[PDB]
């Protein structure tokens, strides 16, 4: 899976502008661990943007 193991930037929503690394993903959404907080959240793949 391409999305697994990628540094991603959230493109829209309240979490817009934040960064993280995708841990697990599906055909609909994905799980991103935030670099700034001690928590892993779930975000939609459409609002995602791979950086680097």
């Amino acid at each position: 899976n391409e999305l697994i193991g990628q540094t991603v930037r959230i493109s829209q929503g309240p979490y817009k502008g934040y960064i993280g690394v995708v841990k697990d993903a599906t055909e609909s959404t994905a799980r991103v661990e935030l670099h700034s907080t001690c928590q892993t959240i779930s975000v939609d793949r459409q609002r995602l943007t791979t950086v680097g």
Binding site: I4, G5, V21, E33, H35, C38, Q39, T40
Partner: protein, 427 residues
């Protein structure tokens, strides 16, 4: 007076404590010799001429407050507290976080706690000057109000100010160091630092190795999380994974990684991971008088009560914690904190002083426009209405213990199992 005058110049004069012992002014006394001496608690009182009690004194105590240990000499007004409270404070005085050593950024210690903004007490004892407490403090002076606000702080619980915490109040960072070296169990058993692959490595977990670089060591500044590879380590038989994982529910950041050699010349590395701990709910806070408690809820600034001026308490503690434990020293410290803050000088709470009492502090507080007993009129934070009872409020030294809730939460549902008796493991 000559001895004192020479002592006051001891950086110019070579006159020191040894020269004081030499002149036969002080005399070391052990217990058996103590059995036969006559001791005077203080000269200017117990040696004047009255109806002769003993009139045969052979020694005199230097200062009565010198009989307390290191930990119990930081309690302010300890002679005003119930006896077990001092013991509890001494117990919990060794678990408060603070700058534990000046050069803490070099040492690769395990489980290092350090607080962002430690402060010296607004009301100290003369004894903690020689403990260097005013250089490595542990705690923050906080505006504490003793009132039942919402019922969220009843059974030894406290309410904290969310806005104050957002402003860094009691924020702390938590270090943790890892160690791993490669040792030769045999010519056929050799361990190396090397990034495992999905092609040749047989035994592996569900943690990918992209975080670490080709060296097998994760570089500093890389976000980590539970069950993530840290030191890529393989063994030879062919190649099985022996890599170390950051333990579950840590989610820190690799602070620094040092690489060196042991006596045998093997490669060696210690990795430090840092984590910031905001004072969330369930954390343990304690006063200097054995008043331990856990946060019950965090209200924002506009929800807390306020005075005529916009002063909102940082912590609110229940009134029911005082009467049973009779920690009147806590109340006296809170009352004198107001005087110290307004007057601008650091108050003194040496145990047996006799120059400081409640009446003097009350008059000094009245000389600044506050109620002489330290009470204030608060307004309700939600409806803005006055409160029919005046609330006792003032600065107080609190200290945040190391028993964080995030280190104690734990749950299980069909996890690992023992080998001898197939029951769940422990820990």
């Amino acid at each position: 007076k000559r001895h004192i005058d020479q002592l006051k110049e001891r950086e110019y004069n070579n006159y020191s404590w040894q020269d004081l012992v030499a002149s036969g002014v002080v005399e070391y006394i052990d217990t058996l010799e103590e059995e036969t001496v006559m001791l005077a608690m203080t000269p200017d009182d117990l040696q004047e001429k009255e109806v002769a009690y003993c009139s045969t004194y052979t020694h005199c105590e230097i200062h009565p407050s010198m009989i307390l240990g290191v930990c119990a000499s930081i309690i302010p007004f300890p002679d005003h507290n119930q006896s077990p409270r001092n013991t509890y404070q001494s117990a919990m005085g060794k678990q408060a976080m603070g700058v534990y050593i000046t050069n803490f950024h070099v040492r690769m210690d395990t489980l290092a706690h350090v607080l962002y903004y430690p402060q010296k007490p607004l009301v100290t004892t003369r004894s903690m000057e020689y403990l260097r407490f005013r250089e490595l403090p542990a705690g923050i002076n906080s505006i504490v109000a003793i009132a039942s606000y919402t019922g969220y702080n009843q059974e030894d619980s406290v309410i904290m100010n969310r806005s104050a915490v957002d402003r860094g109040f009691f924020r702390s960072v938590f270090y943790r160091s890892y160690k791993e070296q490669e040792s030769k169990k045999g010519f056929d058993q050799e361990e190396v630092f090397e990034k495992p692959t999905r092609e040749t490595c047989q035994g592996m977990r569900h943690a990918i190795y992209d975080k670490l670089d080709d060296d097998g060591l994760i570089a500093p500044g890389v976000r980590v999380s539970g069950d993530d590879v840290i030191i890529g380590k393989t063994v030879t038989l062919t190649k099985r994974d022996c890599s170390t994982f950051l333990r579950t529910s840590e989610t820190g950041i690799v602070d620094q990684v040092m690489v060196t050699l042991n006596q045998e010349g093997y490669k060696f590395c210690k990795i430090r991971v840092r984590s910031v701990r905001i004072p969330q709910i369930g954390d343990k806070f304690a006063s200097r008088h054995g008043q331990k408690g856990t946060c019950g809820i965090q209200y924002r600034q506009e929800d807390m009560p306020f005075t005529c001026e916009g002063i909102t308490p940082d912590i609110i503690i229940n009134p029911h914690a005082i009467p049973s434990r009779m920690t009147i020293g806590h109340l006296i410290e809170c009352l004198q904190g107001k005087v110290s803050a307004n007057k601008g000088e650091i108050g003194d709470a040496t145990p047996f002083n006799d120059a400081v009492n409640v009446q003097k502090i009350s008059n000094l507080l009245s000389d600044y426009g506050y109620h002489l007993r330290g009470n204030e009129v608060l307004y309700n934070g939600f409806t803005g209405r006055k409160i029919t009872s005046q609330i006792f409020i003032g600065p107080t030294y609190y200290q945040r213990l190391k028993h964080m809730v995030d280190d104690k939460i734990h749950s299980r549902a069909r996890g690992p199992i023992q080998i001898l008796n197939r029951q769940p493991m422990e820990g």
